[PDB]
Write a protein that binds this DNA or RNA. Structure first.
Length: 118
RNA sequence: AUUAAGACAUUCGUGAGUGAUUUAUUUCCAUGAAGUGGCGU
């Protein structure tokens, strides 16, 4: 058809640099390029060039000569904005007891940047 | 003193009336705010 709607389930928290916005969610500006590369690779059976030729055929390309981009629109929307925020550090630090309801901590995590927050 | 003399092709008259430089045309396409720990062996 024209529209493809999918509902996603989050398994691990996402480190988002635009957390200040209420509606902040997974940005399509990462998913769409990665999705394009994945779809082209699977179209060519492990060869992105054969997949790009296949997508040049059937006119599935915005940019027949230039890019890897396919002709579709990606929109990622939050249905309900109950955000569950996390603090991630690579060091073990004592946990306080004065927090908002949606503040949780992950300690001794691989994410080592932002270690000066404690 | 002679088939002569006399007589403005002149008067009046607005190059004018009606008339959108307008119909149509996406400042768009592309792109991961992301990479990485180390000593304390």
């Amino acid at each position: 058809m024209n529209q493809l709607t999918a509902i996603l389930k989050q398994h691990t928290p996402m480190i988002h640099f635009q957390h200040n916005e209420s509606g902040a969610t997974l940005r399509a500006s990462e998913v769409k390029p990665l999705l394009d590369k994945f779809i082209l690779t699977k179209l060519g059976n492990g060869d992105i060039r054969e997949g790009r030729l296949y997508a040049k055929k059937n006119n599935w390309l915005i940019d027949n000569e230039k890019n890897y981009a396919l002709n579709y629109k990606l929109s990622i929307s939050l249905q309900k904005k109950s955000r569950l925020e996390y603090l991630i550090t690579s060091s073990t630090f004592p946990l306080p007891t004065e927090r908002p309801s949606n503040f949780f901590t992950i300690q001794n995590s691989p994410y080592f940047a932002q270690e000066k927050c404690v």
